Amino acid sequence: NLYQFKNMIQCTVPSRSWWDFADYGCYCGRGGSGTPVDDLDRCCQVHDNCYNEAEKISGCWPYFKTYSYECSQGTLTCKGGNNACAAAVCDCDRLAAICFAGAPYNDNDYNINLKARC
Ligand SMILES: [Ca+2]
Ligand SMILES: [Ca+2]
Numbered sequence: 001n002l003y004q005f006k007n008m009i010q011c012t013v014p015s016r017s018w019w020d021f022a023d024y025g026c027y028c029g030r031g032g033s034g035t036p037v038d039d040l041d042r043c044c045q046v047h048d049n050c051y052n053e054a055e056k057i058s059g060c061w062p063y064f065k066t067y068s069y070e071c072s073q074g075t076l077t078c079k080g081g082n083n084a085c086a087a088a089v090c091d092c093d094r095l096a097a098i099c100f101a102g103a104p105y106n107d108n109d110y111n112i113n114l115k116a117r118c
Contacts, residue, residue, distance in 0.1 A: 001066045004090075011071035017106055018037035023111045026118035034118030037109050043099035050092035060085030064093070069094065 009018050015077070024036040025041030027048055036042040051062045067086035068079040076097060078090035 002063045003097060004067060004069060005093040005097070008069065008071055008076060008093050009100060012076060012101040020105065020110065021100060024105075024107050025070055026114065027113065032118075034114070037087040037112070037117065038103065040100065040103035040105055041109065043103055046099070047092060047096035050096070051089070054085065054088040054092060057085045057088060060088065062089045065089050067093075 005087050006018055009021060013033055021028050021040075021044075023029040025037040026032050026042050027036060027044035029044075032048050036045050053085065054060050054062050055091060065085050067082045067090035069090050070077055070079065078087065082090055
């Protein structure tokens with residue numbers, strides 16, 4: 001569920017306010033298309049793709065379905081016992097939260113002119 005994803009980003013990118021990822025590049029935030037603007041945007045692109053794949057599981061609604069996970073220090077894990085939809089959504093969220101921590105965040109890529117730049 002979105003709340004859990006938020007908590008994962010809060011946990012993997014402590015130095016950046018969690019809400020900074022909501023409207024970044026061509027893919028971070030509601031929807032997305034075009035060529036990713038940088039590595040962070042590519043992380044979002046793959047996350048978007050990941051959710052699309054999870055949605056193929058009947059009745060699997062990524063923003064809603066809750067899953068079991070833990071985030072402590074140097075660990076972010078999806079726990080067992082998650083059903084197929086929760087396991088797929090947790091992995092998409094875990095891997096994106098991690099990927100976000102590997103990419104430079106460029107303030108020039110926040111809230112861009114989508115028509116011109118994507
Ligand atoms: Ca998106
Ligand atoms: Ca925007």
